[PDB]
Write a protein that binds this ligand. Structure first.
Ligand code: CA
Ligand code: CA
Ligand code: CA
Ligand code: CA
Lengths: 539, 122, 115
């Protein structure tokens, strides 16, 4: 009841059942400590660092480490682990190599990007949600370090008009990039190696030069900072490389809807350890030694939560081994433990955005589905959050930009037709009403120029009534007749937004039958290709 | 475009292999891992780069690169005559990790070269 | 029955007939431990590292080493030993040496291999 078999300053009996740190020390967890500010920690009593990170189960749980680590990384199951990647917000292509100006016809265009698009571009919608596994699967679940730019000047003109490249000459690529960090720890003395890659070929790989090595990268912060003039790609010095050359075919692909997408293969950095008196040393402490150790006993979870990206590592079980004493954890539990989620009514609010299997767009990979699908079989609850976490799982959360639950949350910049009363049957509080025609007019002046979106929601009619006729007109028209069922089911109808601030968007659930709508969401997934032809030659 | 691998049981930290691209019996050129191609991590069962990360360009043709691998017309016909290129890594250079009683893992000075001959001989 | 002639934290009598690690320590192997998750380890009682790898017969058998090593390398007879090799999945041949494009007729072809 007082023995410590791993010398982590925390007794095993506290380590097994749960504990907390009170004023410097481990104290047993009594539920009265909750709703007061203390978190219930529970770790592995046979090992020092339950998660694998450099810090022991006591340093994390108490906070006797760097003060730059996130609050959610104090849990002995969430790993202090930085995820670094490059993003591109300006593209320059010129016809010149050395002293790039004054000798060519340069074109430069400002771009925007997103770190989770390659993950959700391989998402096939497959509108069916059969066995309560109301999730979506992608083909290539990559990571948040795979940023994919999207040029936005690009009105109708191509890259050659004003460039004069015809099948023999090579333009040269210049850009202004801006690193980021979506993990929990900082990376000291960062030196990443990124690859600028077209459809399938590597134009050139950047290794951080002498001047571009940024000494500091705290989680949630970029290099340079939020107001500091992004880095010139090479800067064309004696430490720089030769400007990135591309050929005429790639030069047409860049107008053919194929995107450049930046990928950071490996990053090189350090971490900090105190010295009992506040002396922090960061030399010799490299992350490379812990990256493989951490990722091999963890489950990668990503939250997208538009306007910032988060990625976490949470330790797992490996039930096949008896001597693994890592506490088994549910997916709903690991999400809260990794993202600092609070419980509003037992629903894992992140900051105030609702996060549930019914509220957002979950995305998995094939090996995760081949363990979760055959887990929702022997369960008294069809919840995807009540599945047992195991190493190798990959879970992505796409939160919708526009969501409504008819209870407290409403994100649409307009309103619906009507809700018409105070309903309580939606599997979460209130749902919709108004048998008649229900509409909402989205200006499209707030969506994105050439992206695809998704409309999904939970719909039911308790007693076998009419089929609802949905009508969606953004770039196409949609006319579907879905029959509501006994349990609310996700429908996930797709559309596209093009034409660079086109007229409007029309989503109408015109269907009679006294049906119920709850948790209807709108979320962007892919960037749709747009074709640009430079001149039209007269004959 | 090549893609390292690891089929053993341990990881190799700070990997720097020396491979030989060899025709029927002749060495076109031997690659030693350059400054940028040295991959800090190679866990068993995993490749460098990872399973979705754009394999390495052979030389990348920089100041750290070598001159592009030249071959002759006879080899150029052999490559259509059913004779294969086959990559061979002669020696690899890497490290291993040892704890320090408190979770401190050091991987410097711990080179595998000292244990490769000792292990394979018994 | 309790002596250790190699300072590998595992007594020689356990080292000769078989043993396992239970909660941090060497315990004699009784066949009831099988079909439960424990493996019967048996090593050399005259040497620290029976296999030759950098890790001693106790660090392997218990797991007090890197968490990236395979589960099968905890046996004191299987050696922690990495085998690294290069594989080729794309071949490009061109008629040019420096700034390889724009001056030759390049051909590139995707390849598959096997070790
Ligand atoms: Ca512990
Ligand atoms: Ca303990
Ligand atoms: Ca021994
Ligand atoms: Ca012994």
């Amino acid at each position: 009841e007082d023995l410590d078999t791993d010398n982590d300053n925390i007794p095993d009996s506290y380590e097994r059942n749960g504990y907390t740190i009170k004023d410097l020390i481990a104290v047993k967890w009594e539920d009265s400590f909750a709703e007061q500010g203390y978190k219930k920690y529970v770790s592995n009593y046979l090992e020092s660092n339950t998660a694998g990170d450099p810090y022991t189960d006591y340093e994390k749980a108490s906070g006797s480490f760097d003060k730059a680590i996130k609050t959610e990384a104090r849990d002995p199951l969430v790993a202090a682990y930085p995820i670094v990647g490059v993003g591109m917000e300006k593209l320059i292509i010129s016809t010149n190599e050395h002293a790039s100006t004054d000798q060519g016809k340069t074109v430069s265009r400002a771009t925007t990007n997103s770190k989770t698009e390659s993950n959700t571009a391989g998402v096939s919608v497959n509108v069916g949600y059969q066995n309560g596994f109301t999730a979506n699967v992608t083909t290539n679940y990559s990571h948040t370090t795979d940023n994919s730019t999207a040029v936005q000047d690009s009105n109708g003109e191509s890259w050659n008009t004003g460039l004069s490249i015809n099948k023999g000459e090579s333009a040269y690529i210049n850009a202004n990039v801006r690193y980021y960090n979506t993990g929990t720890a900082p990376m000291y003395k960062v030196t990443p190696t990124t690859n600028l890659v077209l459809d399938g070929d590597t134009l050139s790989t950047i290794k951080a030069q002498e001047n571009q090595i940024g000494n500091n990268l705290s989680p949630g912060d970029t290099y340079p900072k939020k107001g500091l003039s992004p880095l010139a790609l090479n800067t064309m010095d004696q430490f720089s490389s030769r400007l990135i050359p591309i050929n005429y075919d790639q030069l047409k692909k860049l107008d053919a809807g194929k995107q450049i997408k930046l990928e950071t293969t490996q990053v090189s950095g350090n971490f900090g350890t105190k010295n009992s008196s506040g002396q922090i040393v960061t030399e010799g402490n490299s992350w490379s030694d812990y990256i493989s150790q951490i990722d091999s006993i963890s489950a990668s979870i990503i939250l997208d939560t538009e306007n910032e990206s988060y990625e976490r590592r949470v330790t797992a079980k490996n039930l096949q081994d008896p001597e693994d004493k890592t506490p088994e954890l549910t997916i709903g539990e690991a999400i809260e433990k990794a993202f600092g989620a609070t419980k509003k009514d037992g629903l894992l609010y992140f900051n105030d955005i609702p996060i549930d299997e019914s509220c957002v767009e979950l995305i998995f990979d094939d090996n995760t589905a081949n363990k979760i699908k055959d887990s929702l079989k022997t369960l008294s609850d069809k919840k995807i959050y009540n599945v047992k976490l195991e190493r190798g799982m990959n879970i992505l959360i796409k939160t919708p930009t526009y969501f409504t639950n008819f209870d407290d949350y409403n994100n649409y910049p307009s309103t619906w037709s009507n809700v018409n009363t105070t309903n309580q049957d939606g599997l979460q509080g209130s749902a919709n009403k108004l048998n008649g025609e229900t509409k909402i007019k989205i200006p499209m002046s707030e969506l994105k120029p050439y992206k695809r979106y998704v409309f999904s929601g939970y719909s039911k009619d308790p007693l076998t009534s009419n089929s609802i006729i949905v009508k969606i007109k953004a770039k196409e028209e949609k006319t579907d007749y879905l029959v509501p069922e006994q349990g609310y089911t996700k429908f996930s109808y797709e559309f596209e937004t093009t034409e660079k601030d086109s007229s409007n968007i029309e989503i109408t659930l015109i269907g009679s039958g006294t049906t119920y709508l709850d948790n209807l969401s709108i979320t962007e997934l892919n960037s749709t290709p747009e074709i640009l032809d430079e001149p039209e030659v007269k004959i």
